[PDB]
From a paper:
Reconstruction A describes the S-trimer with all three RBDs in the up-conformation decorated with additional density corresponding to bound TriSb92, while reconstruction B describes the S-trimer with all three RBDs in the down-conformation without any additional density indicative of a sherpabody. To corroborate that the additional density associated with the up-conformation RBDs was TriSb92-derived, we generated a model of Sb92 with I-TASSER21 and fitted it into the additional density, confirming that this density perfectly matched with the size and shape of the SH3-fold of TriSb92. The placement of RBD and Sb92 models was unambiguous at map resolution of 6.9 Å, and identified the RT-loop of Sb92 as a key mediator of Sb-RBD interactions. TriSb92 targets a region distal from the ACE2 binding site that is highly conserved among sarbecoviruses. Indeed, the ability of ACE2 and Sb92 to simultaneously bind to the RBD in a non-competitive manner could also be experimentally verified using a sandwich-ELISA approach. Furthermore, apart from just three of the 27 RBD amino acids changes subsequently acquired by SARS-CoV-2 (S375F, T376A and R408S, which are located at the very edge of the TriSb92 epitope), VOCs, including the most recent Omicron subvariants, do not contain mutations involving this binding surface. Interestingly, the binding site of TriSb92 is inaccessible in the down-conformation of the RBD. We postulate that once an RBD of the spike samples the up-conformation (the common one RBD up state), a subunit of TriSb92 binds to the RBD, and the remaining two free TriSb92 subunits readily sequester ensuing up-conformations of the two other RBDs until an all-up conformation is achieved. This model is consistent with our findings that following TriSb92 treatment, the S-trimer presents primarily in an all-up state (~54%) fully engaged with the sherpabody, with smaller populations of mixed up/down and all-down states. However, the all three RBDs up state observed in our cryoEM analysis, performed using a prefusion-stabilized (K986P/V987P mutations) spike ectodomain with an abrogated furin cleavage site and a C-terminal trimerization domain, appears to reflect only the initial stage of this inhibitory conformational change, which in the case of native spike trimer on the viral membrane results in a more fundamental structural reorganization.
Here we describe TriSb92, a highly manufacturable and stable trimeric antibody-mimetic sherpabody targeted against a conserved region of the viral spike glycoprotein. To enhance targeting of the trimeric cell surface spike protein we constructed a multimerized derivative of Sb92 (TriSb92) containing three tandem copies of Sb92 connected by flexible 15-mer Gly-Ser linkers. Cryo-EM and biochemical studies reveal triggering of a conformational shift in the spike trimer as the inhibitory mechanism of TriSb92.
Numbering used by the authors:
A (entry chain D): 1 to 60
B (entry chain A): 26 to 66, 80 to 141, 155 to 176, 186 to 245, 262 to 517, 520 to 621, 641 to 661
C (entry chain C): 515 to 517, 520 to 612
D (entry chain B): 124 to 141, 155 to 172
E (entry chain B): 955 to 1052
F (entry chain C): 1004 to 1052
The structure:
Amino acid sequence: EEYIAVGDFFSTDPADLTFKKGEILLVIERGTSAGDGWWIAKDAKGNEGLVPRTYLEPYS
Amino acid sequence: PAYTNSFTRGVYYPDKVFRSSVLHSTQDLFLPFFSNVTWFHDNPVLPFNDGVYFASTEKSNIIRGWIFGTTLDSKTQSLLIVNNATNVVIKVCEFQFCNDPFLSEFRVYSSANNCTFEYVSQPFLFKNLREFVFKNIDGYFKIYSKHTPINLVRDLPQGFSALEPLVDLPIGINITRFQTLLALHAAAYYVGYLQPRTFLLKYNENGTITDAVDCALDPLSETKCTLKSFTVEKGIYQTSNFRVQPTESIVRFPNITNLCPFGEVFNATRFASVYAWNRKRISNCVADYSVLYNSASFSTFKCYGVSPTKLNDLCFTNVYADSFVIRGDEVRQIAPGQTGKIADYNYKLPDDFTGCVIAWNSNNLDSKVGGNYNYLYRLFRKSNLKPFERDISTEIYQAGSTPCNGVEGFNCYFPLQSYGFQPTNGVGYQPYRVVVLSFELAPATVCGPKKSTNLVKNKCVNFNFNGLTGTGVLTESNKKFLPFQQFGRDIADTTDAVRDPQTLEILDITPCSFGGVSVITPGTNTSNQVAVLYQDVNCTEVPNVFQTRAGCLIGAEHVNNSYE
Amino acid sequence: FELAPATVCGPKKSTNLVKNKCVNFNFNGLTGTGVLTESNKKFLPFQQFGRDIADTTDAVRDPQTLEILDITPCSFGGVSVITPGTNTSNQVAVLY
Amino acid sequence: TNVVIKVCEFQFCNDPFLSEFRVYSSANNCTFEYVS
Amino acid sequence: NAQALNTLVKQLSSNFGAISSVLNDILSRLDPPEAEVQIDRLITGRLQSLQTYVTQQLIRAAEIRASANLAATKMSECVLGQSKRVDFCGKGYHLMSF
Amino acid sequence: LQTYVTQQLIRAAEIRASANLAATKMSECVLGQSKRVDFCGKGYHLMSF
Ligand SMILES: *[C@@H]1O[C@H](CO)[C@@H](O)[C@H](O)[C@H]1NC(C)=O
Ligand SMILES: *[C@@H]1O[C@H](CO)[C@@H](O)[C@H](O)[C@H]1NC(C)=O
Ligand SMILES: *[C@@H]1O[C@H](CO)[C@@H](O)[C@H](O)[C@H]1NC(C)=O
Ligand SMILES: *[C@@H]1O[C@H](CO)[C@@H](O)[C@H](O)[C@H]1NC(C)=O
Ligand SMILES: *[C@@H]1O[C@H](CO)[C@@H](O)[C@H](O)[C@H]1NC(C)=O
Ligand SMILES: *[C@@H]1O[C@H](CO)[C@@H](O)[C@H](O)[C@H]1NC(C)=O
Ligand SMILES: *[C@@H]1O[C@H](CO)[C@@H](O)[C@H](O)[C@H]1NC(C)=O
Ligand SMILES: *[C@@H]1O[C@H](CO)[C@@H](O)[C@H](O)[C@H]1NC(C)=O
Ligand SMILES: *[C@@H]1O[C@H](CO)[C@@H](O)[C@H](O)[C@H]1NC(C)=O
Ligand SMILES: *[C@@H]1O[C@H](CO)[C@@H](O)[C@H](O)[C@H]1NC(C)=O
Ligand SMILES: *[C@@H]1O[C@H](CO)[C@@H](O)[C@H](O)[C@H]1NC(C)=O
Ligand SMILES: *[C@@H]1O[C@H](CO)[C@@H](O)[C@H](O)[C@H]1NC(C)=O
């Protein structure tokens, strides 16, 4: 299930990733137990980090 | 090291076309005349730099080939060329580098594993003087050669020699450096370089390039290219133009950063709770976001829909700020599209929130012994809160069907509960001071302070004043401006006077020097010396110099005596 | 097959030539229309075609024969009609 | 002594005038404020 | 002459169908792959303006040359000597001209 | 329109040259006698109307 980012989000936190519009990411397991409303997705370089739940939308 | 002067060599046929008794100008890679050429007599690696000119000395056969490529190692494939006087081997295999490769022969062979492209051809050819030009453009490697028996082996002989193409090879990979090959059983050779320089070529009846000139070497040769002739007659000729480029690119702006305090909303002693978050209007004030980045105190400085770098150059109005107290564990609840307990009943962020959230710990001030029971929150609500809404109400929850008449019971569940922030609480339960800034797009948005680069005078300097920009020399002005003008236009919508508001001192603006350069010559056959003329330019920045009413000219001496 | 420059393909058509006729020609890379005839100029062994002025090709050495030929655009221009007057007479003479 | 700019929600008056500040009908829900 | 140069300057401010009349704005806020489209309609307009000025300039140059030749002719006859031809230099019988 | 104006100017220029020539013939060959030969009619010119 590929997901497309509708906008650009900035992260200060060392736990988190940087994404822009049109970036391709791979969805990971839904074991959201570290924090509520937090999702993890892979980036082009493969680094993993927490990202906002609303920052991504379901592709179709 | 041991530079040598290439008098006229370094020319080759730009194409396989035929021209007879006609002068044609071609723009291609070339070696400028009288250009320094590195001389080795010793075999170190040399860079390619988009074309290499090679010339071996006579009475020698030590040189046997060249190796081209990017790294000449196991990482990237590299081109190998070796000539053994009977055949040429062209490998694009994976070859390692060598400390001192040489040839007894075939010693340069380090590794031939993983051969990508393979090619084999036949050899090309007081003694002959070998000259070769190598270039790689459009993925094609071209080889040029010409053997001319001459004398004066110590230096490059004068004269002319047109290099012809022999072989085209479709290598197609980037080449940045190469290395010559010597046979050990010291030779002298010269290495040049090429750049996109324009030459003029002369073709005889048989279509052989007998002579050529450079279009940027000297003013005399400058006129030849534009005149398409070698013998320019006695006269004055305009050959090109000139100008002066900007140097500093200064920018001036208004006396600034005086306005918009944020300590009253960031460093205020008292902040409201989450159930009574305030929304104060912030507009028409100059906010400096740079100081926030280097605060070294925030913990959840996250920006949604915007980046910290791009919110300074461009900004939006509607800077409503929300301040409230949130415990450390539930800080993440405050985000667009994020639901929960606090995000659902106290403060909900709408989707597509073009703003940032700033939070920092407040253990040393937002806590007291015995528990800080001063901050309250909404624990229960009948319906979810609409984003950006404050619900100040004393209505109590309705868990069951039996209504509550103000008396608390088993199903009333008074929503308002007070937080507990003891000094010994855990990091997750620590009350982190958090503020929220919202940006949306009323005209006349207000952004942060500008560059304010220091100015300069009497120099062609680019300027970008407030709204208006241009390039020109800045100087003092005797003109007077009324107190409600920022710049002035002489005529035909041409700005000629801008007052720097910071200094409040009107300054004239004029385009800096330019015009057409001309060459004065007495005739090609009559003499060789030429004089350069500049038109309508103060003779202080153009480069015997004589200043005249039509600008100054270089190469002539003023004479009081008057002649025809 | 996948796509290093200078790809190499199938053998070229190489059709026969014709002289002294306005004929389209398509050599190895260049093509045009003109009359082909013998030439007196001599090409060096490394040229393919030749031009004289304003990038006008006039001599092409066919690779198949290794011979040099002159190329000229075939006859064209404006045709004019000579008449003595409609009322004076009717016959007219064509002028090329 | 000063000029006050209210873009607030102000009701109409039959005969507004100024004793001063009589024209103040309603200042609720102020949107933009400016003083010079 | 003054207006012919003057009228050329305003042509720089002409949009010629482009969103901006200045080169800097076009090079700033346009995607370079499609930026040349606005430039092309601007170069043609500016080139057309320059073409008219030169062509119009040449027309006056021919007129001036005709005037200069006439002035030279009057110099040849009515200055360097006496003009026998009638009503060529001043009404009445001509003696000389200074 | 550009061509029409440009063509008009060329015709206007040569007409002006013709007008100046016509004015010249008026000054010499009408208002007086043109001693210059073959300027107004073949032969020894006397006068013109
Ligand atoms: C060429 O090299 C010589 C000696 O290194 C030096 O004096 C001269 O200025 C150089 N000229 C150029 C054009 O590099
Ligand atoms: C040769 O190098 C290419 C580089 O792309 C690599 O894909 C290939 O696996 C290599 N094969 C061998 C046998 O080294
Ligand atoms: C050569 O350099 C260009 C410049 O970016 C690059 O796009 C290309 O992939 C390079 N090719 C090789 C073979 O190094
Ligand atoms: C041209 O070549 C012919 C013979 O190949 C020779 O006789 C003649 O001198 C040459 N002319 C020039 C200008 O090179
Ligand atoms: C708040 O105080 C801290 C600590 O002195 C300081 O670093 C920061 O710049 C202040 N911010 C404001 C808006 O006053
Ligand atoms: C503003 O004006 C004062 C008055 O002299 C001056 O000292 C200061 O440098 C000015 N600031 C700027 C940014 O020009
Ligand atoms: C240069 O050529 C001109 C033109 O033929 C001639 O008048 C003049 O005498 C020549 N001067 C010399 C030094 O050959
Ligand atoms: C050229 O500029 C200098 C100052 O750099 C000035 O003294 C001189 O008068 C100027 N010359 C002219 C002709 O204006
Ligand atoms: C020429 O005139 C200048 C200016 O008056 C004067 O300084 C100079 O001595 C004169 N003689 C020469 C040879 O320049
Ligand atoms: C092609 O080369 C061969 C080589 O023997 C020759 O016999 C043949 O005549 C050549 N073709 C033409 C058209 O001349
Ligand atoms: C034809 O018409 C012309 C012009 O009117 C006239 O001069 C000529 O005599 C005519 N010829 C005949 C045969 O009618
Ligand atoms: C104030 O007016 C705005 C206009 O959009 C409205 O949305 C808001 O609910 C109003 N608030 C109050 C308290 O009247």
